[PDB]
């Protein structure tokens, strides 16, 4: 049966609650389609600061794992390493144990027990098996949920709720037919290791910007990024003003009230429109007073990425086994009508 899992909006990502071990140790971790391995901080993890203000053990603030209290833990005597786009990293030991999520249990789930990391907390990677940072192929949560007979396929639906929403939902092996308008549209996954889809164009406030490229739909990314000229064209339409941060690096700003829409044209005639306001974020001076303008939550990068500020505007069904991603404009509702992903 489809495993409905509650997502918690923590302002820069969406987390889920899982249990680990025979004692079902409660940990909270980031749901990330942009990686493939699940890792949780060890009870004695060494959290290293990456941001400014990172307190003592900020990374074990959502629980931690102690193999010792788990009658069913199993050290695999294999080192684990993984790096992420934002530069943070995680180092640990591979283990196997009973992992619980949304009322279901995954037996002998391989995952990593980290002793050093600069991430905010544990990360539940659910991408392609070929995306694992492990030097070999194993069963990650999705494939494991399928192999054990819980869900039909290594696949799940992502329902990042609305920007102001407190919770969202991700469904392993299911689809909540009542949370998306119109009809879902299939998009073939264009990469063998990353959850990428083809992007034809982007229309900003009436401005057509050809893309003819691939873009990463990643729940594990806070904002969105695009290639140099593409991002600059979007910034041009928006009318962004260039500023510099405390490091002398370029940053774009714009009037929070800036009107308009950003229409992402995907293949198979799928178009998702996202109001420019969803890409603007208001910061404040220490005096609580508003900054003159909002920050443009779109920066340039070597890769094209669409994260949370985009996905909240859509219902995303990732079908890893059938190598395809289906999308449709979202419909915000408590109501639900879940069916299995076939």
């Amino acid at each position: 049966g489809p495993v409905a899992v509650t997502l918690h909006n923590e302002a820069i990502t969406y987390t889920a609650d899982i249990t680990v071990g025979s004692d079902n140790q409660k940990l909270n971790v980031i749901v990330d389609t942009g990686s493939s391995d699940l890792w949780i901080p060890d009870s004695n993890v060494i959290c290293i600061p990456k941001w400014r203000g990172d307190k003592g053990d900020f990374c074990k603030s959502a629980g931690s794992y102690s193999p010792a209290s788990s009658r069913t833990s199993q050290n695999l005597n294999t080192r684990f390493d993984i790096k992420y786009g934002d530069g943070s990293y995680a180092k640990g030991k591979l283990y196997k144990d009973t992992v619980g999520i949304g009322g279901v249990s995954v037996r002998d789930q391989l995952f990593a027990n980290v002793w050093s990391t600069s991430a905010r907390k544990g990360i539940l990677g659910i991408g392609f098996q070929s995306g694992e940072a492990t030097e070999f192929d194993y069963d990650n949560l999705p494939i494991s949920l399928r192999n054990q007979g819980i869900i039909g396929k290594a696949a799940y639906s992502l329902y990042l709720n609305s920007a102001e929403a407190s919770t969202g939902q991700i469904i392993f092996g299911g689809i909540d037919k009542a949370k998306y308008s119109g009809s879902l549209v299939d998009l073939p996954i264009t990469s063998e290791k990353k959850l990428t889809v083809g992007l034809r164009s982007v229309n900003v406030r009436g401005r057509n910007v050809d893309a003819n490229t691939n873009v990463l739909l990643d729940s594990g990314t806070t904002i969105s990024y695009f290639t140099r000229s593409i991002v600059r064209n979007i910034l041009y339409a928006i009318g962004a003003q260039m500023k510099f941060d405390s490091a002398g690096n370029k940053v774009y700003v714009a009037d929070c009230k800036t009107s308009g829409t950003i229409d992402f044209q995907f293949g198979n005639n799928l178009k998702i429109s996202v109001p420019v306001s969803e890409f603007l974020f208001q910061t404040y001076y220490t005096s609580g007073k508003p900054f003159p303008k909002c920050e443009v939550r779109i920066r340039e990068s070597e890769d094209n990425i669409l994260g949370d500020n985009f996905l909240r505007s859509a219902y995303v069904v990732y079908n890893l086994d059938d190598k395809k991603i289906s999308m449709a404009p979202v419909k915000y509702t408590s109501e639900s009508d879940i069916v299995a992903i076939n």
Binding site: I82, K83, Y84, G85, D86, R120, G220, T221, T222
Partner: peptide
Amino acid sequence: XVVXAX
């Protein structure tokens, strides 16, 4: 923010 794996 974050950007999740190389």
